[PDB]
Amino acid sequence: PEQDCAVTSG
Amino acid sequence: KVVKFSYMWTINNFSFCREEMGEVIKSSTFSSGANDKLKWCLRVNPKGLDEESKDYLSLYLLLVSCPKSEVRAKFKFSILNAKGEETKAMESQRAYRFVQGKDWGFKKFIRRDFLLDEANGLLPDDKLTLFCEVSVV
Numbered sequence: 001p002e003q004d005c006a007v008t009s010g
Numbered sequence: 011k012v013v014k015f016s017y018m019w020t021i022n023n024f025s026f027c028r029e030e031m032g033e034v035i036k037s038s039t040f041s042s043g044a045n046d047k048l049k050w051c052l053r054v055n056p057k058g059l060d061e062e063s064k065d066y067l068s069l070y071l072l073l074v075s076c077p078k079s080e081v082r083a084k085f086k087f088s089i090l091n092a093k094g095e096e097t098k099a100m101e102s103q104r105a106y107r108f109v110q111g112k113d114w115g116f117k118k119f120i121r122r123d124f125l126l127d128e129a130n131g132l133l134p135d136d137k138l139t140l141f142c143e144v145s146v147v
């Protein structure tokens with residue numbers, strides 16, 4: 001995957 | 011109503027920035043304007059900080075100020091190429107919840123090899139330019 005759209009927190 | 015704004019962040023000498031700037035890099039603080047309680051920054055890990063993301067640049071939106079209370083925002087990040095065009099855009103689909111010191115974004119925003127391959131035109135003069143659009147309810 002060139003980009004992964006899973007949103008996480010730091 | 012929604013308050014929609016943006017920030018353009020240029021990281022110079024991107025290919026050396028992990029050495030010169032570190033594991034985590036915070037942008038300058040920004041807001042929509044002078045009529046705005048809210049202060050935000052971007053945070054980049056030029057290499058992701060676990061086994062899985064090690065091949066990725068990670069990109070987050072960080073709420074820096076101490077606001078009224080909880081803030082709900084949507085965000086969009088993209089990479090501006092050599093021609094000034096927006097590419098590789100990804101969106102929060104919904105609004106995430108920020109408190110002071112809370113960030114949200116993409117641990118695997120983009121593969122480093124994609125970014126470093128010069129054919130893709132994403133590091134003109136080794137400058138990475140990131141565009142963030144933020145939408146606060």
